[PDB]
């Protein structure tokens with residue numbers, strides 16, 4: 001009961017979800033000349049377990065890989081976080097050609113897709129209870145820039161064949177999504193929200209300066225997925241990005257000089 005179209009677009013989401021219109025929404029524009037270095041930002045680390053992966057779904061907005069988080073398994077730590085955090089899911093956001101598709105922008109500059117890795121604080125007992133904290137979620141954000149094929153990313157792409165359609169689920173194990181990471185772990189950090197409804201203001205963002213490169217033909221395989229079940233009328237999922245919301249008075253810090 002929401003969408004990226006023209007009667008369900010993001011423009012309207014608040015008509016049914018009213019966080020959608022709070023003071024800490026994501027995504028944002030990042031204006032590098034308004035951003036300062038903070039020398040108290042440490043680096044982050046992951047311990048992930050490739051065996052945590054379970055399923056891959058197409059929920060009609062996006063493709064999801066789900067992981068097992070019933071205990072402390074694949075862990076994100078350091079950075080600005082207070083504590084260690086659990087991996088739960090990743091997905092993506094894209095548009096309809098390569099010149100655009102990311103949610104965040106950096107000095108105007110748009111990327112072709114954004115990858116989001118979702119984590120949650122064990123301190124808050126439960127993914128669902130952490131949606132009510134300001135720092136309950138942690139997202140690692142990655143940009144996708146056109147280029148050379150990515151092989152670890154293919155692994156994932158190959159599986160899309162089995163969920164083409166909204167609804168569809170399939171098994172997906174043994175994938176470590178740290179494989180996708182680029183070489184640098186330089187980061188921008190801010191506080192905001194989920195970009196899809198219900199738009200909870202739950203998120204510590206960690207955006208990575210460095211883009212993971214991918215192929216145009218890799219990108220058009222993501223662009224194939226569809227948003228109608230089988231028994232129903234085709235329709236492609238051609239865009240799924242949300243446009244930048246208001247910073248108000250929010251401070252964006254960089255890990256890096």
Ligand SMILES: [Zn+2]
Nearest residue numbers: 091093116195
């Ligand atoms: Zn997302």
